[PDB]
Design a protein around this ligand. Sequence first.
Ligand SMILES: *[C@@H]1C[C@@H](O)[C@@H](O)[C@@H](CO)O1
Ligand SMILES: [Mg+2]
Ligand SMILES: [Mg+2]
Ligand SMILES: [Mg+2]
Ligand code: NA
Ligand code: NA
Ligand code: NA
Ligand code: NA
Ligand code: NA
Lengths: 1018, 210
Amino acid sequence: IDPVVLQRRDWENPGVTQLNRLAAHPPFASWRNSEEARTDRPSQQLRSLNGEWRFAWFPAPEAVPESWLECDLPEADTVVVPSNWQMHGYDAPIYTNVTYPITVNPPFVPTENPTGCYSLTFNVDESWLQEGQTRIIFDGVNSAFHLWCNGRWVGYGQDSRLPSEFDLSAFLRAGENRLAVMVLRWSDGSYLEDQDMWRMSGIFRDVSLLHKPTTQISDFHVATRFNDDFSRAVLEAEVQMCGELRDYLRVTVSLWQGETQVASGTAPFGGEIIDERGGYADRVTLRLNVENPKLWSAEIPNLYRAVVELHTADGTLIEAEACDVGFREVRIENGLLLLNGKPLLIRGVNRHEHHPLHGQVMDEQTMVQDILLMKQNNFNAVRCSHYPNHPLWYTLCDRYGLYVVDEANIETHGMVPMNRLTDDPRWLPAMSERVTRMVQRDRNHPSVIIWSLGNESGHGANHDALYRWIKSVDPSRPVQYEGGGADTTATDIICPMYARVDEDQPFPAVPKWSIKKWLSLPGETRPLILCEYAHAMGNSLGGFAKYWQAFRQYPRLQGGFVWDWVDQSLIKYDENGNPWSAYGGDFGDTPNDRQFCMNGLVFADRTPHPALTEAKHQQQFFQFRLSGQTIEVTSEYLFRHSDNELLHWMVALDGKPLASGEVPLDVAPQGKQLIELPELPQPESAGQLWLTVRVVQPNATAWSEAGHISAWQQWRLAENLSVTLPAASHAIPHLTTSEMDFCIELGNKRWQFNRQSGFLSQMWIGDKKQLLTPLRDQFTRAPLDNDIAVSEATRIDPNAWVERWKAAGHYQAEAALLQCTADTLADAVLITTAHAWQHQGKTLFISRKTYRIDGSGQMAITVDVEVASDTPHPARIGLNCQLAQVAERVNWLGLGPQENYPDRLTAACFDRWDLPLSDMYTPYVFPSENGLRCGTRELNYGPHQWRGDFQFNISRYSQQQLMETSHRHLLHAEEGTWLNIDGFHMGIGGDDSWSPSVSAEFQLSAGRYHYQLVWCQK
Amino acid sequence: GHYQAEAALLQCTADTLADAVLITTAHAWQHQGKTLFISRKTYRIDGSGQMAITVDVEVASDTPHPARIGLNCQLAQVAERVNWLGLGPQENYPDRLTAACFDRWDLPLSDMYTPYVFPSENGLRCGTRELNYGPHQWRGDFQFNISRYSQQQLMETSHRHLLHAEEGTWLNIDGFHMGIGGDDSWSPSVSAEFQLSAGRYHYQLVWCQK
Ligand SMILES: *[C@@H]1C[C@@H](O)[C@@H](O)[C@@H](CO)O1
Ligand SMILES: [Mg+2]
Ligand SMILES: [Mg+2]
Ligand SMILES: [Mg+2]
Ligand code: NA
Ligand code: NA
Ligand code: NA
Ligand code: NA
Ligand code: NA
């Protein structure tokens, strides 16, 4: 194909971002019936061209044969559109984080430029061509394209994340027509699309045809302005037209509240005088008064319907357009972000448009599934990281109720320095279009409360210009932008990524201050909402509660957006057709950044990670205090009463329920309720009483089913310590001493301590061996993504926990025996052991133990550990062994039921839990230490019971296998069951995942540690 | 009832090992039917003359966190000097020990008492690994105070000038001690991290002759 199209190379020129593209505008449907517009029903004037298309792949646009313009290529395939062509296997998707997937040489792209040739033969009815305007709408094309209709060149478009529209009126004929779309993978637009995500291409959002009359609504803006107490509002609708102006033309704007018309107004065209040359003859603004409007919030998403009718004075409708209207005010005042006059607390998450099968194509089902899960887990806000979303997303957020940060498709992370392009006025045109056309599209959505200038593009003069452009065109929403230090002149909100709660990170030029400190820096007055925090990569969200404590305590700390919602894993199939989750590098893509695309609170199929429950608990909308027998409930709702809430309470003695009841909740927003519990029966047993409360929603909502639990909290009540001594045992265990073993016999039970190793190597119950691997101290864990601390494949931080561990010899050190002795007591055998772990003549740890086996068949293991002060703090201080048994169930008295770690255990509840063994393993795509449960007093597995105060995990996978396997699908069940029982376990961290992030209070730094376990048969 | 709690014996047994005698004890402290604390100990006396005291303490979760978890006795010996390896040389407490340095300190006994005009617990030194007083040596990882005044006398006396040296020397050796606070002096002011709230406590002392 040629000639001007190939010679001009528009995809290597940031001065050309489009040719012949129509102006951006809010969603249109061109209804010719007002009632269909009101009810938001399908429009005959809006056709989908989604479905089966013809497609051929080429290595470069030069390889595209001319004949393709005229007719179908025989070698083409029939494929579904929308789609990313990488998902159909035509070439590899690439995962890189920061480094561009192409040589950095702006505005040039590689000569080998994968080219997708899409075509469609389709019908157009004569009615559509006799009169009016027929346009084609490409909602998303990645990254740039030329368009032909029936062999004739139509135009060109850039920006993968906003719609490109072209007038086809002069190109079409009645009956059969053919479209030819040449999509280029790389363009100068790629320099503005360096988001930390899979790099794909193609026609990946809807394609549609829209018919508008020649005289048409071309744009409209809806604003809602309020009095001081929000009891009065004015809806202001500016309407623009194209076509010939006539005196008989009219616009009517009506506002609907369900079936009730609340207001209507009509005017001819002709705006007020704006300057010395007059006003806009082709515009009119309608003003409607609304008394006591029902206000829109995420809490209660009240919506009205505005209908915009273009018509003649005699009453003949030309066309109607429409939108949902949410009556809400967003403003920053005295340093606080307010919604309808009340300060928001953002329970937010970043959300990419990712599907493990369809790549970056978004469907309604997945969108709805995401929103439901978000709301069920107490999220009220979403950031569109890092591009305008599929248009349906905003409609759903409007109707379900979520606060939205709408973000321009501008990320230049890979530039050196980051602002090389954004400070260059030659790139201001390309940047402006990414901002301005976003605003023009999305400005009528009530769910959009904040505009964002993009992501990770430094701070340049181009940001300041566009910041001001938005502030000028839309004063209704704050503008934020994190680049260049998070608090620049281009942001209304201090919006850092991964600024910690208490700890400063004083990077040169772009420091990350403690969020508490940041607020009070000399002269600073703005609110702080983190654009990204609590990096949810694999086994993560350590310290999430620290953020939420601070958000609640500090008025100007107004929350943040977790990074992020969903793992960007992709599905591949093995030789047997079995699906597996894949990450960076698994497609032959290179260079790549491996698992760094998986940072989600949920797996790609939307199965929750364990971190999601911690998020739900910390983001609860009711706060609880206990005083005596009085529960104080405080509502953090700003607008709604608790009109779908009852409080269930339960008192239990070590898991055994003793008393329970329920009280309806009747709490005003920001209000308090006092609940006096009845007099509780005193227990005639030793142990700890535990109070658990939970908030239950009795009725189904749009986002939840009847019985949904929205909040919970636990307290210790009375404890009665056990003073009664167990009865003197009848049986007495016997000590047999050989050269190789200390053996202990009690009935048909046997304990065998290997005297060379100094470990318990075997146990027998009759003729059944109990151990496959001896019981040994363990001080290492299979490294979490946080311990590894890598964000770019070719970058290692020597301070990373795994790096320090490896270098200190933690994973290398082996036990050296210092002492192994045996003694007979009055009613017990006492085995005393001392070991040392060494690396290069350096003692890392010393473990001193006693094993006391008594007549009741209980083995009491007392362990005292020394950790050298100059060695890096160990991942854990515990024991492990491989059990011969494989049982169906795991039953424990401790924190659960889900996986919990010391810095991520607030959501867990103390109680008696019983799960299948498989649930005790968390299938993180990148395998690591997982499945731990803390605060555990009793553990039951098969014939075994362990008692003490410990943390444990239990599974068919050794720490050794977990640390040696890169992918979960490659793990194999080992013989029997691996048990890791820890006196102490280090935090998991997660403030970020590319530097040490475990807070000091969760590091194993005490130097000397003590724990005790009792092992017996159940 | 922390000041009134009475020690009730639960267990006291003796065992003879290969090279040691082992005494095992358990006690419960109770006030009006409520068990406040349980102390479980072993004393291991070997052929070298050393006595290893292992102490494990349970504290009821619903009793106010205790001021200390340790042992005390009145020694017959009155010596002139106190020698220790730990934080010093001056009085230091868990929430007030940043100024103290770890080293070998040697002071007159009188320097181990702080003469606050209103008498109270005083003269603690923390992070101590070895303590020497006359013929005795204690080793471990503990906090201690040492003086001629019992906690009882300090508690019962309003003015320092009314204190009288008791026979011998009162030794208070703690595995754990609560912070002193002071953010103000008219409400609870000891921060949570310096309160003895762990519920279960472990410490070991070795007592021998120097
Ligand atoms: C902030 C920006 C986002 O796109 C991700 O790169 C995240 C780390 O995974 O940091
Ligand atoms: Mg271009
Ligand atoms: Mg980035
Ligand atoms: Mg809690
Ligand atoms: Na706040
Ligand atoms: Na990432
Ligand atoms: Na209710
Ligand atoms: Na691994
Ligand atoms: Na006193």
